[PDB]
Design a protein around this nucleic acid. Structure first.
Ligand SMILES: [Mg+2]
Ligand SMILES: [Mg+2]
Ligand SMILES: [Mg+2]
Ligand SMILES: [Mg+2]
Ligand SMILES: [Mg+2]
Ligand SMILES: [Mg+2]
Ligand SMILES: [Mg+2]
Ligand SMILES: [Mg+2]
Ligand SMILES: [Mg+2]
Ligand SMILES: [Mg+2]
Ligand SMILES: [Mg+2]
Ligand SMILES: [Mg+2]
Ligand SMILES: [Mg+2]
Ligand SMILES: [Mg+2]
Ligand SMILES: [Mg+2]
Ligand SMILES: [Mg+2]
Ligand SMILES: [Mg+2]
Ligand SMILES: [Mg+2]
Ligand SMILES: [Mg+2]
Ligand SMILES: [Mg+2]
Ligand SMILES: [Mg+2]
Ligand SMILES: [Mg+2]
Ligand SMILES: [Mg+2]
Ligand SMILES: [Mg+2]
Ligand SMILES: [Mg+2]
Ligand SMILES: [Mg+2]
Ligand SMILES: [Mg+2]
Ligand SMILES: [Mg+2]
Ligand SMILES: [Mg+2]
Ligand SMILES: [Mg+2]
Ligand SMILES: [Mg+2]
Ligand SMILES: [Mg+2]
Ligand SMILES: [Mg+2]
Ligand SMILES: [Mg+2]
Ligand SMILES: [Mg+2]
Ligand SMILES: [Mg+2]
Ligand SMILES: [Mg+2]
Ligand SMILES: [Mg+2]
Ligand SMILES: [Mg+2]
Ligand SMILES: [Mg+2]
Ligand SMILES: [Mg+2]
Ligand SMILES: [Mg+2]
Ligand SMILES: [Mg+2]
Ligand SMILES: [Mg+2]
Ligand SMILES: [Mg+2]
Ligand SMILES: [Mg+2]
Ligand SMILES: [Mg+2]
Ligand SMILES: [Mg+2]
Ligand SMILES: [Mg+2]
Ligand SMILES: [Mg+2]
Ligand SMILES: [Mg+2]
Ligand SMILES: [Mg+2]
Ligand SMILES: [Mg+2]
Ligand SMILES: [Mg+2]
Ligand SMILES: [Mg+2]
Ligand SMILES: [Mg+2]
Ligand SMILES: [Mg+2]
Ligand SMILES: [Mg+2]
Ligand SMILES: [Mg+2]
Ligand SMILES: [Mg+2]
Ligand SMILES: [Mg+2]
Ligand SMILES: [Mg+2]
Ligand SMILES: [Mg+2]
Ligand SMILES: [Mg+2]
Ligand SMILES: [Mg+2]
Ligand SMILES: [Mg+2]
Ligand SMILES: [Mg+2]
Ligand SMILES: [Mg+2]
Ligand SMILES: [Mg+2]
Ligand SMILES: [Mg+2]
Ligand SMILES: [Mg+2]
Lengths: 177, 260
RNA sequence: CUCUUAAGGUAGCCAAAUGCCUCGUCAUCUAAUUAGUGACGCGCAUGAAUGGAUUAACGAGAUUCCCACUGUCCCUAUCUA
RNA sequence: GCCCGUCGCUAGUACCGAUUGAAUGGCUUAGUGAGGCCUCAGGAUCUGGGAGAAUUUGGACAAACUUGGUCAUUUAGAGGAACUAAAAGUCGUAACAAGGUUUCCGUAGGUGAACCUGCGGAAGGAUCAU
RNA sequence: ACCCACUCGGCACCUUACGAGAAAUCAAAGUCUUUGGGUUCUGGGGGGAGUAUGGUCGCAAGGCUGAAACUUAAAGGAAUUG
RNA sequence: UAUCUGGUUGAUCCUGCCAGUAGUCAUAUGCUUGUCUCAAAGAUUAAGCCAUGCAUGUCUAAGUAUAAGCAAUUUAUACAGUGAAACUGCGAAUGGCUCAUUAAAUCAGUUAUCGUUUAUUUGAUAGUUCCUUACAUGGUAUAACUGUGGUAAUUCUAGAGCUAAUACAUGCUUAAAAUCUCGACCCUUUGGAAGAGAUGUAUUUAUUAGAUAAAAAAUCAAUGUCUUCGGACUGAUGAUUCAUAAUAACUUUUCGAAUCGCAUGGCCUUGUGCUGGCGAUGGUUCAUUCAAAUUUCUGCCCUAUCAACUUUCGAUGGUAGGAUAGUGGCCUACCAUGGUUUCAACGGGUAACGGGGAAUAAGGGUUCGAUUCCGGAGAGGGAGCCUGAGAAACGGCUACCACAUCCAAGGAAGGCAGCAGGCGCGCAAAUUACCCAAUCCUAAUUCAGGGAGGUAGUGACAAUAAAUAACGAUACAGGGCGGGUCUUGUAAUUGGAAUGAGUACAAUGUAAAUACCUUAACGAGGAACAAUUGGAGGGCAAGUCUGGUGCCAGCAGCCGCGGUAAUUCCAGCUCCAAUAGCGUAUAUUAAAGUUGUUGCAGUUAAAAAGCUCGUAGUUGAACUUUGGGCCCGGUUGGCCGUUUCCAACGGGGCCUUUCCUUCUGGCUAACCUUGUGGCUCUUGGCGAACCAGGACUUUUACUUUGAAAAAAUUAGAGUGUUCAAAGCAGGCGUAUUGCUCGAAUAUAUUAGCAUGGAAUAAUAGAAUAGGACG
């Protein structure tokens, strides 16, 4: 009777499970952008392989086939609108080539670091969670925002966060009492 | 299976009613009436979903029981009444009137119309034959029988309906070059006015249509609804007059209205 | 290995109408079977035209069980000549 | 060195097998036949030729019970006969070296056991050759 | 009858290897990952086992058809060195 | 998103399997478990059995109220408000559950009714009812009720006394008109008449009309309007016996309002006269809509250790009937001997409901679908049936079988594959809770009812987001270029910061709660708010550390480890992988080109029948309008910033001896038509462009495009759910009384339909001419 609540998975999994070449490599990415799960990496490989064998499929169509452009130009719009594809690259032969790290450097937990304002890449992840920084009045506690380079302009802290103008905060207030 | 089904699950509901899946389990099963079940729309969705006058279903019943609503003239208090294409819904409060007319996306659109226009009607005649005592009658897409029409009305033609009373006065004909309205398939919504009609004795005569953008298409004759003369209709078409904007056409103009 | 023979019972088959022991042992049929049947075999003392083994068909032949049937019986009673 | 078979131990699997063996389902002959329905009657009454209960005739439909048959799916069994684990132990030496009678195939008979012998083949021979 | 030359169709041999193959070797076993001329048949690890079971042919011996349970990490091929 | 790796050997290359590996809307179990969202869940085994409670009832101004009912008000002395009980009506055939049976059945896509039923909704439709008489309105016979009773016992009911109707059962009515039938008289002719009845709809039958391929005459039997007395004189379909109508009758004669509510008014010739408003229930017949029932074409899994099957006792057809709502061997009677099959019939199997779909990502495939949506089947097993529009119903009845409860032993009652809960079965699956607030549904109906449905609980089924920490200062130390001033940081004292997990005023949330969102007060330093699960010889990432054991115990998916220094066991330590999760078993997909159409292998590794014939099946050489010319205008891109100029890529039509079926008119859009860049313009003259009627057509396969096409699923656009899985929203002002975009697109592909193409591959054609045009 119920209508079926749709779901899906967000992470693939390496077939060879112990390729230490790719396993060190995986961790360098992990301990760089501040990730907890190697499946935060496996996750963002997944969409990439989707974008690719979405995109790779379009360059088979006869050049400028009706739908190849509609969702072609729909695709490259989506990725510059988050700023992973750079503005030179909006004719979609180069979207096949989005090496993974581009996606990670466009996180929230990442740019909150590259804007200064994160002493470490992990001071980032720790304050995002804790009622700290926002974009509008809209607090965000998801270190995987994928900020869209438009709203990257306003990433100052929140008004209720006692690091960007607030009341003292919970344990300060009786360190002083 | 032991007689009449009287329930309608969701996702059995007609898509063009645009109900969200999770609001329960069921759509409102339209009642029996003028319009085919799958080819109609009930009052409770009109007053609740597309037009958002009422919040819940319980309210829609409260609304109708005050004789507020009229369709084609009459009080018509059936919460699930099968109101269909080309009906008129006068609304006593607000002095609003709506003719029921498709988009070119094929759904039922909200379309306010004049008080003058709110008192005539058309119908694709679906049958014509003699009857009791030999008085001929026409019957049309909407479920009414007009006794004593002219011998010149054959079948497949539209008819003006006074609907303060019964009779017809004018009857547009089905010939090469009359304004048509596709009322099925999903060329549903597109418009205009002939190319020609392939006979195909045995069934399923094919109707060729040329929209007023020099774009052809074909649909079956059962689903072509002549509505008059080139560019000269006999009712008020809705916005964009059904000329099947492309996906890129539609989103090029989608971003044409770009600056606030 | 050994004594010994003319040769030392092969293929087959069995408590077989051939087995003492013996109402053999195991199974089977039964409530219960010195019965029957199927198995077993150092078989007192099975065995090859002393013919061996197997066999459809046949039998007023010996034997076991089932169905039907019944005064054979429980348990006797009555009639006719 | 390798290695074959009978023979003996332990364990497991499946097979054959007296029990005219057992069990579960699907049909189904023949026999008996509930019930409601249709129908011939009936006439407690209850009425203006009608009604109508009990009862009843004959039907089609047909559960079901008794005894069979058939199909499918299972399955107990004295005992018999395989295989395996399995490499070993007993007896021998079959094959592998011309394996000490070259080997193998088909067929036939014989032998504790591998095996032996006859007839015709093959070389994968131990001979690409007068 | 013999000699010489050519040409059809035979039984084979020889030299090559373009080519093939795991190799031994192969004018097919070639013209296959640059994979498609037509068509028939069989095989899918080794044992179990061509056993069991049914069907069928036979006078018989046996022929054709022909499983599974279980067991097992090999068994096999060609070549190299000992 | 096109990958391999470990194991045959002394070493080698193979064939080959085993093991490894990864996924699973895939079940289970094990260890571990904090937050948000999401939210499947007694399918598998046993469609096995069920205690108890609940899951279907329903009233409007408008069928029935003398409750000895409450309430009194209020014009109301018939009724009137309110209304239990009860009748009447309607519903109970939807829903929800389960997957047992079912293999040409269901189902799917595509059809058919000119092959039928159709409550309801919606739209139409009724001057006729009598007779050679209540219409100011006709009849009892009953519930409730009262009262007397029975029984251990039930939604048991008996005897008696009342009374209602939109229940039951009856039974009047209305204009004109015309057409048919009889026809007393009169009067004989060319012949006509007074008035007598008949003629609603529905049923049954027979007869007729229902035209139409282009035009005309003569006559026999009747016999219609006008005499200038010779005489003259129209529906639909491709398609019907269709719609409709006419005639003679037929009928235990259908319907044709004895109903109800709100108002009450006109109009005298003042009659209890005559009239008349709005809307409710009904009522035939037609149409509509919701349906149903059959039905066309094509498509199912394994099986030949199933080859013949179908008529006993219908098998295949014919005729006639019967029965049905209707077609039909559905059934019967008579007659015939047919029907299916290697192009796999028939039988068997199925741990089989079908589908939408799910899993697995080079592709081609392989596997799965009890399970939210559609269809079907069932309600312990059968069969039978009442009611009804609709049921072969089971929260209906009846019978049998099985199960099974109560008892006073006489009898009575039960059907969870509804909700929950219980027993059983098993590897295997949750509360005997809350609400009609939403979603919808039903009733007499805005109100009542709804275990449909939604709420919470249970809930590591799956799915998403992602806490268990974050910055210092210092101190020996490295290293930058003696430690100096740049941190690599390893530090076993420190340090002030931050926060939800939790807790909790509060508001929010909600039907009432609960959580979540928001938020005072609390709420973190190692004792913590303390992460797990596996593993560390190889495949395979991480130690030949230490202790134990001594072929023991144990490990080891596989190769292999342990018999006294164990890289493998039991541990301590350290280390790796994944991480709120991770291991194990079973299945399954990838890897697997080990099922091979794509795409395998067959000399010796597994595998060419000893041999040839040979039916089925598969396959099968070549050759029939090619080539040339005129034209039209399309779509990219170029030089220019679309007219014309260049290339190239496609569409059509022409003429080249050149069906394009074909005419009979209707049509003509086009020209041979009447300074050629440019086009209006009637008076001779294009065909096929297709209407619609006629006549007549060799059969296919393939490919194009298109229609028909359910949602959810999938692919995918838009949208910043705080992110994400999702959802189908949302976004703007004048946020004082509105503005506005949406809710795409794609996808079906086998079969059917429609359409363009004429290569490729078939079929057919003139040879005894029984040929072709006329
Ligand atoms: Mg409804
Ligand atoms: Mg012997
Ligand atoms: Mg004896
Ligand atoms: Mg004894
Ligand atoms: Mg005995
Ligand atoms: Mg005896
Ligand atoms: Mg004996
Ligand atoms: Mg003996
Ligand atoms: Mg003795
Ligand atoms: Mg003797
Ligand atoms: Mg003797
Ligand atoms: Mg003899
Ligand atoms: Mg014999
Ligand atoms: Mg005898
Ligand atoms: Mg005897
Ligand atoms: Mg017996
Ligand atoms: Mg009868
Ligand atoms: Mg065996
Ligand atoms: Mg030897
Ligand atoms: Mg030797
Ligand atoms: Mg020898
Ligand atoms: Mg040799
Ligand atoms: Mg030669
Ligand atoms: Mg070579
Ligand atoms: Mg070579
Ligand atoms: Mg024989
Ligand atoms: Mg080894
Ligand atoms: Mg080795
Ligand atoms: Mg060696
Ligand atoms: Mg494996
Ligand atoms: Mg069950
Ligand atoms: Mg279930
Ligand atoms: Mg049950
Ligand atoms: Mg009263
Ligand atoms: Mg149902
Ligand atoms: Mg059916
Ligand atoms: Mg009476
Ligand atoms: Mg006509
Ligand atoms: Mg008729
Ligand atoms: Mg009056
Ligand atoms: Mg069999
Ligand atoms: Mg017949
Ligand atoms: Mg016959
Ligand atoms: Mg076959
Ligand atoms: Mg089944
Ligand atoms: Mg696929
Ligand atoms: Mg496979
Ligand atoms: Mg299903
Ligand atoms: Mg299935
Ligand atoms: Mg099942
Ligand atoms: Mg039933
Ligand atoms: Mg029930
Ligand atoms: Mg039911
Ligand atoms: Mg008693
Ligand atoms: Mg239950
Ligand atoms: Mg579970
Ligand atoms: Mg519930
Ligand atoms: Mg519920
Ligand atoms: Mg913790
Ligand atoms: Mg702490
Ligand atoms: Mg550990
Ligand atoms: Mg390693
Ligand atoms: Mg250890
Ligand atoms: Mg894993
Ligand atoms: Mg192919
Ligand atoms: Mg192979
Ligand atoms: Mg060999
Ligand atoms: Mg051969
Ligand atoms: Mg043969
Ligand atoms: Mg050819
Ligand atoms: Mg299409």
């Amino acid at each position: 009777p119920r209508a079926p609540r749709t779901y899906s998975k967000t992470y693939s999994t390496p077939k060879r499970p112990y390729e230490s070449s790719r396993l060190d490599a995986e961790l360098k990415l992990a301990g760089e952008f501040g990730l907890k799960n190697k499946k935060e990496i496996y996750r963002i490989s997944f969409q990439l392989s989707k974008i690719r064998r979405a995109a790779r499929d379009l360059l088979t169509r006869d050049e400028k086939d009706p739908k190849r452009l509609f969702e072609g130009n729909a695709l490259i719009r989506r990725l510059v609108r988050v700023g992973v594809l750079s503005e030179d690259k909006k004719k979609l032969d180069y979207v096949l080539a989005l090496k993974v790290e581009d996606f990670l450097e466009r996180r929230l937990q990442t740019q909150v670091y590259k804007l200064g304002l994160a002493k470490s890449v992990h001071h980032a992840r720790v304050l995002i969670t804790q009622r700290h920084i926002a974009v509008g009045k809209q607090i965000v506690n998801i270190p995987s925002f994928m900020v869209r380079l438009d709203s990257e302009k306003h990433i100052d802290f929140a008004p209720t966060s006692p690091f960007g103008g607030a009341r003292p905060g919970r344990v300060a207030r009786r360190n002083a009492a | 299976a032991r007689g009449p089904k009287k329930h309608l699950k969701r996702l059995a509901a007609p898509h063009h009613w645009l109900l969200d899946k999770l609001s329960g389990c069921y759509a409102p099963r339209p009642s029996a009436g003028p319009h085919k079940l799958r080819e109609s729309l009930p009052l409770i969705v009109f007053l609740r979903n597309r037009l958002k006058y009422a919040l819940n279903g319980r309210e829609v019943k409260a609304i109708l029981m005050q004789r507020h609503v009229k369709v084609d003239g009459k009080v018509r208090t059936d919460t699930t009444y099968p109101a269909g294409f080309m009906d008129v819904i006068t609304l006593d409060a607000t002095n609003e009137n709506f003719r029921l007319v498709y988009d070119v996306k094929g759904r039922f659109a909200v379309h306010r119309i004049t008080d003058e226009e709110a008192s005539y009607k058309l119908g694709k005649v679906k049958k014509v034959q003699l009857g009791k005592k030999g008085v001929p009658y026409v019957v049309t897409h909407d479920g009414r029988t007009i006794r004593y029409p002219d011998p010149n009305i054959k079948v497949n033609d539209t008819v003006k309906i006074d609907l303060a009373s019964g009779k017809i006065t004018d009857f547009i004909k089905f010939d090469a070059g009359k304004l048509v309205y596709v009322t099925g398939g999903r060329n549903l919504g597109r418009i205009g006015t002939i190319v020609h009609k392939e006979r195909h004795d045995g069934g399923f005569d094919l109707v060729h249509i040329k929209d007023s953008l020099d774009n052809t298409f074909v649909t079956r004759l059962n689903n072509v609804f002549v509505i008059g003369e080139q560019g000269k209709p006999y009712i008020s078409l809705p916005k964009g007059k059904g000329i099947k904007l492309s996906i890129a056409e539609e989103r090029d103009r989608r971003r044409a209205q770009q600056g606030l």
